[PDB]
Amino acid sequence: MSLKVNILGHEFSNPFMNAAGVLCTTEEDLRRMTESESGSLIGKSCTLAPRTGNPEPRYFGLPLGSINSMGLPNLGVDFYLSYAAQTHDYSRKPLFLSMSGLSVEESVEMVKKLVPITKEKGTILELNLSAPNVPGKPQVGYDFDTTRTYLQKVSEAYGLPFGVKMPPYFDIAHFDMAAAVLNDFPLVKFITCVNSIGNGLVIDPANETVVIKPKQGFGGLGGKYVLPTALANVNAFFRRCPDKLVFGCGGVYSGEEAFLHILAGASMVQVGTALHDEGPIIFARLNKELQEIMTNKGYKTLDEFRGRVKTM
Amino acid sequence: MSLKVNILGHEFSNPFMNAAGVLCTTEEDLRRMTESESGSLIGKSCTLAPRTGNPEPRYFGLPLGSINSMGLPNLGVDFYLSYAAQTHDYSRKPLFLSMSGLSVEESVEMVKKLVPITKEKGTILELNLSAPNVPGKPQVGYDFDTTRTYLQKVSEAYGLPFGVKMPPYFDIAHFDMAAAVLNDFPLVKFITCVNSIGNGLVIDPANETVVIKPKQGFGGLGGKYVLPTALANVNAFFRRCPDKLVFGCGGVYSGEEAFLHILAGASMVQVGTALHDEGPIIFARLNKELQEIMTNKGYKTLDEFRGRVKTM
Ligand SMILES: Cc1cc2nc3c(=O)[nH]c(=O)nc-3n(C[C@H](O)[C@H](O)[C@H](O)COP(=O)(O)O)c2cc1C
Ligand SMILES: Cc1cc2nc3c(=O)[nH]c(=O)nc-3n(C[C@H](O)[C@H](O)[C@H](O)COP(=O)(O)O)c2cc1C
Ligand SMILES: O=C1C[C@@H](C(=O)O)NC(=O)N1
Ligand SMILES: O=C1C[C@@H](C(=O)O)NC(=O)N1
């Protein structure tokens, strides 16, 4: 069976890539993702200038996933642009860059720099509208006026196909409102559902203390916590945004979860917490497991079942 | 040693009660809750007229909790009012009633009927601003203008202290905005955090079909999925609304989870999915387990640690 995905003129060997933020901050990280069996990779959500991020501890692995408040530690846009222009081996796989300016002005400055490199190399933009661990910066995706402004200014500045990393929604009316904004921007060719379930709290019963230092212990949840939310968001936008692709992100630990994401509507499938836990070898495993399911069900390609989840 | 709680003018034997919607729809349900070891109980979220709710299947037990789209099945406000006025044994424990009118006009008519019964019997109101499984009805709590209207009109019609059942928030700006609205209504004396994580989607990989019938498989998540979200919401409102109580609801399966809720600021702890799984015997187990933790830590009362979660 074929795991191939054909989107934006590119051939991807399989639907798997890292979730933005995991194994993608440094040159070494990005090398390891390139050498892995993943179909693609994405750079850390970057800002105009470098950031060291939040104080420690800011990450904690959980039995059911992860909580983090990293605070967008990144080497700055120039580093990732340079990686995309000079270092990355495009013969191995295509590259995405995530950009997370803390203002529309910052985002505009950054994407303008990407234009020449997208034209030359084919580097793909994911605009992050859901960074939940920066003190004093609300998630853009939870204000539809602000979301409209970002999409307007970035569409105009970048002028090329791009995608958006969205926060999870939990209300039908929000799925509708979000889709209505997204559908006004034709250059938005993909939607990544979802970012962390924002601002959860984990407390250690032994010492009666929170497990992360920033924001009084409040951090984004990933892993097993997020699968049903992720599947819901993937399916909601798959149906509401037929002119666009949907990328799935959340709760993928196995080919089974990957299969469910694709059944829900996903084109690419991103792996965060599970990759942080296991390392890039996970991609070899995911390919094997997804192949096995497709073999068992007699699916020859992903296109035979993408978005074909059955309702009652 | 004592699990006792003194709030809203009552002594509660212990902090435990059912989550609204679980073991509280029929007279038989309410009898079993009253006979249980629970410190209190709350009636099913009711409407002006009876409802039978959504078609089957509308509930599905999961390894990590539950998904439901019940659709507010209830015997109508008159039934729960008559239970409160005539049937309930107040010498056993205090009674809460949840009310979830599908419009502000419906809510007003309902709470007006409760006034004489609160005055006579001491019945407590929990206004549901987070009912996520009624098609065409957005969650009131995710619209702060609508929330303000409900609180204004109910404050006016009811005119006595009451509480609110809130949806989970995932963004610091939303915690701020929610608290700003709540803090404008002095009659709001408690905040229950949280209702289900709304509009999750569960898919069976074997038959490639959603597991519940209503809303294309979309339903509220309960159980292990929601504990970090619940703790965060409890603590966020505990800090932002110092003139109000907070009740904890989400992911309680054991004395340990109860302990964490109370540490975060919970006065009362509600049990949903776990109670559905185990039946009312769980309250005897929870009392024993909580006391065990307190014994090990050398605490004699809940007041020794309620709201005393430590940050770094
Ligand atoms: C350590 C860590 C760092 C992350 N950094 C980013 C980031 O820079 N940009 C982003 O859009 N999402 C970031 N995320 C969120 C993930 O991309 C992903 O949306 C989320 O973890 C859910 O996927 P999962 O269930 O596979 O973990 C980060 C998550 C983790 C755990
Ligand atoms: C079968 C079922 C019915 C529910 N009905 C109601 C309801 O009528 N009103 C309400 O406010 N919450 C209702 N809920 C939500 C619960 O009160 C609770 O907030 C949620 O399940 C999270 O708690 P848990 O993790 O202990 O399940 C219901 C949940 C379930 C599972
Ligand atoms: O988009 C983001 C940003 C990242 C961080 O905190 O750096 N962590 C997240 O969970 N999501
Ligand atoms: O508040 C509510 C309503 C209930 C239902 O659907 O009846 N189910 C829920 O999960 N929460």
UniProtKB/Swiss-Prot annotation, chains A, B:
Q: For this protein, what does the record note about how its cofactor is bound? A: Binds 1 FMN per subunit.
The pathway to which it is assigned is: Pyrimidine metabolism; UMP biosynthesis via de novo pathway
Active site located where?
Answer: 131
**Disulfide cross-links:** none
Record's signal peptide: none
Q: Enumerate the catalysed reactions.
A: (S)-dihydroorotate + fumarate = orotate + succinate
The record, for SUPFAM superfamilies, names:
FMN-linked oxidoreductases (SSF51395)
Q: How does activity depend on pH?
A: Optimum pH is 7.8.
| GO biological process terms, semicolon-separated | 'de novo' pyrimidine nucleobase biosynthetic process; 'de novo' UMP biosynthetic process; fumarate metabolic process
Positions bound to FMN:
20, 44-45, 128, 165, 194, 223, 249-251, 272-273
Q: Which GO terms describe its cellular component?
A: ciliary plasm; cytoplasm; glycosome; nucleoplasm
The EC number on file is 1.3.98.1
Binding of substrate occurs at 44, 68-72, 128, 133, 195-196
Q: What is this protein called?
A: Dihydroorotate dehydrogenase (fumarate)
Question: Which organism was this protein described from?
Answer: Trypanosoma brucei brucei (strain 927/4 GUTat10.1)
Lineage, uppermost ranks? Eukaryota, Discoba, Euglenozoa, Kinetoplastea, Metakinetoplastina
